């Protein structure tokens, strides 16, 4: 029913979004979700810039043209000790997503995100969860593909 969107701080405009605490985003839902954050799927160059200033996660997610995981420090539980903006080869499942926002500043922006700003009307309880754990709840919808809403 409800949808929790757990987000990171933005690094050079790039951020991670995880839905409902598990890998649950398709490519079409990823595009809709970035759009609802006034954002786009990142390019590889945008990911590399974010990586260069400290962005890493232990999660795979969509970008433009790939599914990736950004890694600075090797960890056996996060792409088997690989580093870089690491590209997933077998990439047909559901993941998290990354998003790029053009308005964000060049370094790290942790300003609280207090709604999903480019959603539309709907009946879903949507909660933004910031990196600091603070939760902000609204009603709306952001998905435009029937196959995502009604599998």
């Amino acid at each position: 029913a409800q949808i929790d969107l757990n987000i990171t701080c933005r690094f050079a405009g790039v951020f991670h979004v995880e839905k409902n605490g598990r890998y649950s985003i398709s490519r079409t839902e990823a595009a809709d979700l970035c759009k609802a954050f006034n954002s786009t799927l990142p390019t590889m160059a945008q990911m590399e810039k974010a990586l260069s200033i400290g962005f890493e996660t232990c999660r795979y997610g969509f970008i433009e043209g790939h599914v990736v995981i950004p890694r600075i420090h090797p960890n056996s539980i996060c792409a088997a000790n690989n580093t870089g903006v690491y590209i997933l080869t077998s990439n047909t499942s559901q993941y998290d997503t990354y998003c790029f926002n053009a308005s964000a500043p060049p370094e790290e922006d942790c300003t609280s995100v207090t709604d999903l700003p480019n959603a539309f009307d709907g009946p879903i309880t949507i909660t933004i969860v910031n990196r600091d754990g603070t939760r902000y709840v609204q009603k709306g919808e952001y998905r435009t593909n029937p196959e995502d809403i009604y599998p």
């Binding site: 987000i7 954050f37 006034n38 954002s39 998003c99 926002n101 308005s103 964000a104 995100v113 700003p117």
Partner: peptide, 4 residues
Amino acid sequence: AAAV
């Protein structure tokens, strides 16, 4: 207007 166009922020996260």
